[PDB]
Design a protein around this ligand. Structure first.
Ligand SMILES: CC(C)[C@H](NC(=O)[C@H](CS)NC(=O)CCC[C@H](N)C(=O)O)S(=O)(=O)O
Ligand SMILES: [Fe+3]
Length: 330
């Protein structure tokens, strides 16, 4: 029962911000090769100060009190907050559940936004802690949303060129005024003793914090601290993904797999149990509620696919509910 390591290439994505079109294609080739292999790659030379990101994230988790957690809790933990299906605090349960997190959405989702006015599902107005109790936290969090939005937009240009399309094939549906993208600030704590009820056992015997799944996203742009935990499933079993706290771990979600007729699969992955204090900060690249991408098959000469065009809002609503049903309330 030995575990091999996945090939996760480090791809210099900096040409995707520039105007060297041939250099972009060489990045797009690397994205294509990784997407056809294990499905994961590390985006390096990305331009985001991930050191300050981890600092402000650590200060928040370690300073927020049980009172503030109730005040920000999503509906799953607080019946009073019926509007908080997505955004808010995800409480840990000592002795039963180790993980806790804070999820926020598009800062442009305000009471003035028409999707909020129409009460469209998956659209919510972010909740925030008290400014004086968490100085600068909301400003940092909202700016990070747009920092990683910019990186994700360039990554989407690479994916589009990799699939033989014009560079805005995905990015044109990725807009600040309507994106359903989310940030989740996850804390995985060190615990002694660690509650066995918080540990799950995979079929192959591996102890897990979160079971196998495909991401509900177009792509996922993830930062993690330097604690190895992720595994990707291959035909020869699960393979360890090595940690890198300077780059962004990138992978496709099931929406990408649908629209490419599984040409770019959504890699199945799981989270091993590790008794180590660590952060996981995913940015789930979601499109707009009405966004619809016509499916195609890059393996066919005509590129024709028989799959239905899927509206992203309906995909996201069904996907997040199914993931909760399958892998439990996080
Ligand atoms: C918290 C931990 C258990 C982590 N799990 C996840 O984040 C999973 C797998 S990707 N994804 C979600 O729960 C979707 C979140 C959607 C978000 N609430 C929104 O409204 O967009 S971990 O184990 O993977 O680190
Ligand atoms: Fe995931």
């Amino acid at each position: 029962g030995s575990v091999s390591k996945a090939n996760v290439p480090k791809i210099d994505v900096s040409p995707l911000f520039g105007d060297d079109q041939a250099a972009k294609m060489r990045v797009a080739q690397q994205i294509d090769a990784a997407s056809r292999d294990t499905g994961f790659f590390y985006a390096v030379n990305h331009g985001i100060n991930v050191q300050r990101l981890s600092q402000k994230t650590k200060e928040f988790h370690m300073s927020i009190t049980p009172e503030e957690k109730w005040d920000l809790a999503i509906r799953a933990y607080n019946k009073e907050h019926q509007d908080q299906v997505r955004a808010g605090y995800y409480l840990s349960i000592p002795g039963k559940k180790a993980v806790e997190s804070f999820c926020y959405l598009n800062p442009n989702f305000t009471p003035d936004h028409p999707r909020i006015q129409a009460k469209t599902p998956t659209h919510e107005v972010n909740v925030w802690p008290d400014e004086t109790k968490h100085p600068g936290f909301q400003d940092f969090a909202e700016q990070y949303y747009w920092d990683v939005f910019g990186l994700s937009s360039a990554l989407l240009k690479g994916y589009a060129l990799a699939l033989g399309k014009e560079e805005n094939f995905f990015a044109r549906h990725f807009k600040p005024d309507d994106t359903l993208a989310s940030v989740v600030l996850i804390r995985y704590p060190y615990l002694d003793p660690y509650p066995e009820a918080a540990i799950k056992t995979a079929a192959d015997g591996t102890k897990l914090s979160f079971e196998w799944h495909e991401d509900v996203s177009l792509i996922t742009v993830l930062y993690q601290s330097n604690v190895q935990n992720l595994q990707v499933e291959t035909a020869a079993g699960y393979q360890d993904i090595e940690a890198d706290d300077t780059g962004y771990l990138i992978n496709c979600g099931s929406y990408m797999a649908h629209l490419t007729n599984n040409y770019y699969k959504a890699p199945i992955h799981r989270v091993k149990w590790v008794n180590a204090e660590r952060q996981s900060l995913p940015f789930f690249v979601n499109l707009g509620y009405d966004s619809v991408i016509d499916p195609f098959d890059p393996r066919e000469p005509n590129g024709k696919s028989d799959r239905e065009p899927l509206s992203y809002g309906d995909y996201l609503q069904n996907g997040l509910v199914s993931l909760i049903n399958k892998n439990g309330q996080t």
